């Protein structure tokens, strides 16, 4: 799905949406393409354990440095563990193999920290994938979800992009924390502000990075 997203972006960017002509960004909005899931919080502890995050539905996940993944559903008990060889496994926090004790402990720690100290991005919105991969640049953290969605959070201004290749849409969250979902094809049609245009150009570069970094 990344290749498909890469093309969707190439197209919108090639149209030079903000360059010229009367920009009618509002007409490109498509509330029907609202994202189901997105990362609302994250903690970068990759120096020791890995990346911890919270999805908008309050489920939490961790992509450990050993490429394994642990997902805790919003009921606070159901767990899904993904080994390196894709081996998906179901369980609970109450009944789990002793071997996962360390990883379940770390997830609880992450969950605690996030729920108590971090803001929920998209908290004013009403919307299970796991974190396939992620990386960070000087200006952003890029999150690639297993459902094909790609999220880009810009550190400085706190703006965020949520790219869904299925919907061929992009949800932009501006500094005022406004939540707007646009259909990429319509952005080509009606254009958009310099701000979103710039971030979509960045998005393409990130998508390309994801494609040449995978394995």
């Amino acid at each position: 799905h990344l290749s498909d997203m890469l093309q969707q972006l190439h197209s919108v960017n090639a149209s030079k949406p903000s360059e010229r002509g009367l920009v009618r960004q509002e007409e490109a909005e498509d509330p029907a393409c609202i994202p189901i899931f997105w990362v609302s919080k994250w903690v970068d502890y990759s120096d020791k354990y890995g990346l911890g995050y919270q999805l908008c539905d309050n489920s939490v996940g961790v992509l450990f440095n050993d490429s394994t993944r642990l997902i805790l559903y919003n009921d606070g008990d159901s767990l899904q563990y993904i080994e390196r060889d894709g081996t998906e496994s179901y369980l609970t926090v109450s009944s789990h193999p002793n071997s996962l004790m360390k990883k379940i402990t770390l997830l609880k720690y992450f969950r605690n920290y996030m729920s108590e100290h971090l803001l929920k991005a998209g908290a004013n919105i009403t919307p299970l994938p796991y974190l396939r991969t992620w990386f960070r640049t000087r200006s952003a953290i890029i999150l690639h979800l297993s459902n094909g969605s790609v999220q880009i959070n810009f550190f400085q201004d706190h703006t965020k992009l949520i790219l869904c290749p299925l919907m061929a849409a992009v949800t932009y969250i501006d500094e005022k924390r406004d939540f707007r979902t646009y259909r990429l094809s319509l952005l080509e049609e009606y254009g958009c502000c310099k701000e979103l245009a710039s971030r979509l150009r960045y998005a393409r570069t990130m998508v390309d990075k994801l494609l040449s970094s995978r394995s």
Binding site: K41, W42, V43, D44, Y45, H117, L118, N153
Partner: peptide
């Protein structure tokens, strides 16, 4: 940042 927005 080692974490998202507080």
């Amino acid at each position: 940042x080692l974490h998202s927005t507080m």
